[PDB]
């Protein structure tokens, strides 16, 4: 349930790549190949899945989203049955790369949240801007909009949300298009506020949502705005005043404090956001209220020790030694992760791997 009131109007990071399967690879058994690109900016990226030096035809990808630091992440995936002679990889091109990078498939009780992410990217002399919006409950996405898609409607992405009727879907579509109209204006406004020509591409990112505790009582609320991956204006933790990033944003901070915009947002974040998060948790409780404990395992002058965690939900986890690769989506709703540490051969028993996850009775300690 997005903001019902039309919103008030107004750095380059390279991607990290991971190529893996959904399930452990078994020759002759259907599986899924994944290429997870994360932590990059801007959003233009070319991703290919390769089979024996050839492009895989039917490849699908997830809807664009971004993290706290504003960097984007995506999951490219396709179905395949690995056999003996086949070799797979993923190729990624991005403005930060001299030439495309190839990565080969190396075969060998908690809080809750509702979040909405918005991304608008200008296309000089190529039509309207690209507008993408996705909704999340905890780590499960449940709605999406892509201005380039056919429907021009808010679309479901989880089973429980398909319950809702036409009144709900009509409203959400009316609201998302309003978010779109606002972003379209801001792009031109911010182009002027930064003295940029009408020839370059620019990005505006918006994120807002609310947190509740295990008692489903309001905990924290967010509302943030970013231009080209840099902070522009955000609502402070108390939801009563704004944080302006630079000199250009102070004009907007004063226009919004003059129009008391933070009061309407606080009411949404404290009330409506919470109320509909509660309804979602109940409607899809077979999904959103489950906890999948990680199936854990360990892999091994110097040698390498790697702790592995697979098929766990939610994504929040901690693997610590006594190299950490970003948590990645399995593609079926679960996640994976591993951590590594170097060790002189022989002294592999004086080290341990600790795993703090929300679904485990107590922490697990792993050693050779």
């Amino acid at each position, epitope marked *: 349930y997005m903001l019902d009131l039309q919103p008030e109007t107004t750095i380059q990071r390279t991607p990290k790549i991971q190529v893996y399967s959904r399930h452990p690879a078994e020759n002759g058994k259907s599986n899924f190949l994944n290429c997870y690109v994360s932590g990059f900016h801007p959003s233009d990226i070319e991703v290919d899945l390769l089979k024996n030096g050839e492009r895989i035809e039917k490849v699908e990808h997830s809807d664009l989203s971004f993290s706290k630091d504003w960097s984007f992440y995506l999951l490219y995936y396709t179905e395949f049955t690995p056999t003996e002679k086949d070799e797979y990889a993923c190729r990624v091109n991005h*403005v*930060t790369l001299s*030439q495309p990078k190839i990565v080969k498939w190396d075969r060998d009780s908690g809080s809750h949240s509702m979040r909405y992410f918005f991304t608008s990217v200008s296309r000089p002399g190529r039509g309207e801007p690209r507008f993408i919006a996705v909704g999340y409950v905890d780590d499960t996405q449940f709605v999406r909009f892509d201005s380039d898609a056919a429907s021009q409607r808010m679309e479901p992405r989880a089973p429980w949300i398909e319950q809702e009727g036409p009144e709900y879907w009509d409203g959400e579509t009316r609201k998302v298009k309003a978010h779109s109209q606002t972003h379209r204006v801001d792009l031109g406004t911010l182009r002027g506020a930064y003295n940029q020509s009408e020839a370059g591409s620019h990005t505006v990112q918006r994120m807002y949502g609310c947190d509740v505790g295990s008692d489903w009582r309001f905990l924290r609320g967010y509302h943030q705005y970013a231009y080209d991956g840099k902070d522009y204006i955000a609502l402070k933790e108390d939801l009563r005043s704004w944080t302006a990033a630079d000199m250009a944003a102070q004009t907007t901070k004063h226009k919004w404090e003059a129009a008391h915009v933070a009061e309407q947002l606080r009411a949404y974040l404290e009330g409506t956001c919470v109320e509909w998060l509660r309804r979602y948790l109940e409607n899809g409780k077979e999904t959103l209220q489950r906890t999948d404990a990680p199936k854990t395992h360990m892999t091994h002058h110097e040698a390498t020790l790697r702790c592995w965690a697979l098929s766990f939900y939610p994504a929040e986890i901690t693997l610590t030694w006594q190299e950490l690769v970003e948590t990645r989506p399995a593609g079926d709703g679960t996640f994976q992760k591993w951590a590594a540490v170097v060790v002189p051969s022989g002294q592999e028993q004086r080290y341990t791997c600790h795993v703090q996850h929300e679904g485990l009775p107590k922490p697990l300690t792993l050693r050779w």
Partner: nanobody
Amino acid sequence: EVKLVESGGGLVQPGGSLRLSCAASGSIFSINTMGWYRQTPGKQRDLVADISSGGSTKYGDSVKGRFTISRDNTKNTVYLQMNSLKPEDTAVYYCYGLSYSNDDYWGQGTQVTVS
């Protein structure tokens, strides 16, 4: 391991055409996909066209309809027929090839200029 010999670049008037060709050395069973990326004014190089040994093609949006890639059935040689060239097609065009183990090989490149 593999050597990629390029030729066919140079200068052309706006609206003109050029034929690039790239020939792969080594074993004929050591190369599958071959094509061309091109240098951008910035740091990255963008896809222009490539083709699998079976003839599957993919083009970059900015050359769709104007550029055509083809391959010799016998030898590992590809051809890029560039038509209706514009100044914004000025760049160094790098031939490339993929081993059947997904190893990439890159040529020196050929400067293409449109007045």
